[PDB]
């Protein structure tokens, strides 16, 4: 999957901004959230998040769930580098293992678990 955000900003601008955000908010991680290519699910109004590193992935699911106005019966899946991240992880842990070289963590969401 390609992210619109990577398609709109040259790599060097991304890395420069990511580097600065990590220095300026060391208790947080910068995260880009976009809908997966062929997913049938609501749109997400905002895609750039400055997330406390101690927030769990589970809590972030809930937060994103709310922004999309998903009902509880509705499914939501995160994908990071083709892996579904564990809900028990903190966003800081997820960020450490999966952030890209522009210092951003990219998360795709979908109604499908594949």
């Amino acid at each position: 999957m390609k992210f619109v955000y990577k398609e709109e900003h040259p790599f060097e601008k991304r890395r420069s901004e990511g580097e600065k955000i990590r220095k300026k908010y060391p208790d947080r991680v910068p995260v880009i959230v976009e809908k997966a290519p062929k997913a049938r699910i609501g749109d997400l109004d905002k895609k750039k998040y400055l997330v406390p590193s101690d927030l769990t992935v589970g809590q972030f699911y809930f937060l994103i769930r709310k922004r999309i106005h998903l009902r509880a019966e509705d499914a939501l899946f995160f994908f990071v580098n083709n892996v579904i991240p564990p809900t028990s992880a903190t966003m800081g842990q997820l960020y450490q293992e999966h952030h890209e070289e522009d210092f951003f963590l990219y998360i795709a969401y979908s109604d499908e678990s594949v």
Partner: peptide, 14 residues
């Protein structure tokens, strides 16, 4: 909520 350079600042719940 609060945004800095269009980044949405997420609060840590209790």
């Amino acid at each position: 909520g609060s945004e800095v350079d269009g980044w949405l600042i997420i609060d840590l719940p209790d």
